[PDB]
Amino acid sequence: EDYEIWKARMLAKAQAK
Amino acid sequence: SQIYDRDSFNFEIIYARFSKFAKVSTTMQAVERSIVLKAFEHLRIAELIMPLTVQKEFEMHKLALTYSQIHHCMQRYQALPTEVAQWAQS
């Protein structure tokens, strides 16, 4: 997993929480 | 030299021919191979043995003596043990 798409998906999981 | 008709010898051949006598000599059993090697070098520095001109234990050599000189050394030698005097004849 690339760091950029992982950081973006984790920010999406935070903002969707 | 008498057996092989003045062929060049080696420290290993002469040490083997000496050890075949030393195993039954009943006075020469105690010598190390290193003492026989230093005795061979002592023969070499007197030019009683000359190189054919390789390890120092395997260099080929030539006797620098006639057999009559060794035979007169056998009679002129002082306190020669009888075992060596018998081994010299055969």
Added chain:
Amino acid sequence: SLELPYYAKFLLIAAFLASHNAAKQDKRLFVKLGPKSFSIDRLLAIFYAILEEKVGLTCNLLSQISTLVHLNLLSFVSGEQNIMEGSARLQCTIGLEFVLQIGKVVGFNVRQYL
């Protein structure tokens, strides 16, 4: 009492087998007077045959060959001027008992190949 690196020990016993086993017997022992001359590639072939582990040919292994030559554990009976061209001939210059001691410390039984 000569402590050695592990691959230097295998190189030294391989040089002893190269100088003690003659050129013809390697084909029967490894496909699975005086000490003999041997070329460096014959030494590497006997070393890879007895190694049974197969390390790569790094700089350090051929450096171990040259520094075994510098310690008078091996010798340059000929060649000298052209070590790299394959015309060099080496000659192992150690006794059998040191090889048996190295084979005790290593665990390689030298007498099977003699």
Added chain:
Amino acid sequence: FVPESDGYFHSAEHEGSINAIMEEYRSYFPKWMCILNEGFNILLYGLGSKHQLLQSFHREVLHKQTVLVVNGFFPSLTIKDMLDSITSDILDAGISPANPHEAVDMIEEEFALIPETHLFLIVHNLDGAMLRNVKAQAILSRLARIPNIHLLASIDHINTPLLWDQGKLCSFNFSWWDCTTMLPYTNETAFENSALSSMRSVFSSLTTNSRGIYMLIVKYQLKNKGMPFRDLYSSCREAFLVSSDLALRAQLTEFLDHKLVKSKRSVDGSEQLTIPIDGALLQQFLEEQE
């Protein structure tokens, strides 16, 4: 690479790809400057020619530092030439002493006298045609030991580390780098280290009597499928192609100089005169002379 001993006991797109490879090796350079600053020396061991890469390192990065380029692929360089170059041009100390290790001792003293005067040393092909002896590698390792002198070097031969023992390989504090360019070995093989037409071109320059002497050897060779010297001497004295023996020996010395004739002496003392060319081309040459 783990070779098997049984082989001894049984014995376009390319330009863009090479340019991307060269741009990556050009991108490596600041890391090489830091590695050379820490005391390691650079060694390149790729497949193709690395001349242009080290020239780019000298051009783009070492544009102002003192630099001694050394062409190791040169057939005729000597280690005395390199030590004389350092001692005379870098330090203005005159000619180096005739013992090379004395010259390295002198270079170590004079470079101990001058901190922050670094001497970069670029050696294309450290395995060079005249650097393959152990002594020149010992001199190069003693030079690379110096804190002031930094070393970059190329390696091409497969059997190169056979001459580096652990003392030289410890003096050569190498940082190995796989700079595998795919460039052809133009400059490295351009030097001297790596025929019926020529016979006609040299036969055209000969005089008439030399043509007759070589035609006599050609006729004897085609007739016998090397002639003794006495038959050539009697044939030349019969055909009036020579005045005495010594002029015929001078003509055959000229033929040996121009390699038309090989002279092979016999055990009986007679001189044999082989022509080193196959007999079909020799028969065609005799037909050319008619």
Added chain:
Amino acid sequence: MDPTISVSKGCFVYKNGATRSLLGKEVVQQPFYEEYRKAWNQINDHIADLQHRSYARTLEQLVDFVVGQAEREVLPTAALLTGINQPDHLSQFTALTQRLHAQRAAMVCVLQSRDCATLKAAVETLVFGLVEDNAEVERLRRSQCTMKQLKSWYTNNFDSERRQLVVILPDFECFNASVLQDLILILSAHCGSLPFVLVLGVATAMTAVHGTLPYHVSSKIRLRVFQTQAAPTGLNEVLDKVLLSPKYAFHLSGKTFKFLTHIFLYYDFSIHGFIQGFKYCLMEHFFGGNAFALCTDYSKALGRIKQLTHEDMETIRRLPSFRPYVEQICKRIIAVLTDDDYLKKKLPQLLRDCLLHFLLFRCSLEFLTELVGDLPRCPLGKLRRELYVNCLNRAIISTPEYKECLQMLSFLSKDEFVAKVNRALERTEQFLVEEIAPLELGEACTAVLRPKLEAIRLAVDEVVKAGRALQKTLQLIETQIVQDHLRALQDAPPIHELFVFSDIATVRRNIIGAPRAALHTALNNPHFYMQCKCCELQDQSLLVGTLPDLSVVYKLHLECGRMINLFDWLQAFRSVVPQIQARFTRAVAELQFLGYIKMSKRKTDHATRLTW
């Protein structure tokens, strides 16, 4: 062509004001260069101190031998049975010259084998070294430094006072034999008039000394044998006292540790090559950025956190251990992944966590290694370094060898078991008092560890005052020391990547040199390097027609026998693909330049392969 490519010259000066710190100020003023230089100076000075403290006993014995000869024909002479690692011993002989000059007991010449190809050159370098050494304590040409001039110089100087004339011969094995024997006879001829002492440097054994010295030469020798310590003992001392010290914040991973010790034990016994390889590991670690300049002692680490910019924040986020730290946590991770200042405020807790974990790792290792390595058969090894590599490389409790250690420790009698655990407790407490108390962040480490040791000692008292309690004591030792303070490196606390160095591939590439592997994979599959869209081979023996020209010639070479006629080789290459003959000649010339083939001399138009 290029101006550097000349037909006449071989060397090309580009002098720029040379008479008779390479980096610019941007790099030296960067914090990572500062922390790298600090850690390297500390590590190098500690290793040099260990080497001097190991050599000091043999140094005092050699100096006492020289002074005892000075208190007083054969020349006295001292064989020094030093190790195979010849370059390392120049510091030993230099320390001997420093001691002999400081006592004013002797003057020293050093005879390298490179300087003495002949007896004349040996005598000239010997006399020149003695006279110039005396001149350097408080220049004649080398043609005139006769031994008679040495006698006249010694009479003009030291006859009125006796200085010994020590002649170090560091590389005894490298000498010509006749030059060395003639030199020993020359020095023995001058005894009485000139006091000579002849220390030697025998890398092999005394049998070499007895072999190269003949009956006449050894008649004039009164040698005494000194023994330098073994190279593996020096490696073990350096690895335990330096690379495993608590006080350094930089640690190797277990793979890098095993790789450097594998180079030492399996290739060369040079300590210096191991030190340069550790220096390359330290440089490859610390040159990754100022985020790796955080890897230091705790106060300077807090100053580095307050120094930081943004690329350092990005490279502390990118490192792999941060991702489990984030997923094992919403607004807090938005402030961590974006706000930057919150990560700057949260860095000291993570750095203290990592440094405390590595301190507890070293203390729990100093516990466990005695209790495990005293055992017969040693499943986890004897010394601390093997247990260091084992506990870092993988989780220790899941290994079969830990089960074997638990079984063989369960089989013990009560007296040896209680004595073993009490020895481990006393050793760990002595280590906690001696080495962790002076260190910063050592008070908190002692506060974490000491109650656990008191609980293990209470379990020992419970098994003393009362069979099955030994299993409870093993359970206490497992779950307060092995489980908590001896985790595998993947289970280390997050942002431990700043402190360990696990990148073994690039460093193994740049230290271990394998030119033959690169030439092999370049001459077999060029697609590995060129990365063409057409040149890929599904197998390495295919020989496709789009290959680079050296590879086709190399494969048609490889697929046949030893002696190779050039002509059918040319027909096969012409069948694969005028200028084609010139391309074949260029490929054969390059393949000869690499040493793979050579032209025959006895047979024209043929080539023999040098490889097998």
Added chain:
DNA sequence: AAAAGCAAGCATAAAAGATCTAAACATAAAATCT
């Protein structure tokens, strides 16, 4: 019958042995500085 093994033969080459020569070293004539 297949591939390892002993005399044969020319050949690069290696010693060598004298021999001649080029460069390093010691040294004298001389402008130069005082």
Added chain:
DNA sequence: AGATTTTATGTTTAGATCTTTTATGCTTGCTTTT
């Protein structure tokens, strides 16, 4: 009118060369065991 590099020169020793001679080795041509 005297000391100091400076330079031009001669000697000597190490290295290049010519030549003979001798040898191991590279290849060949049978030769012979498995």
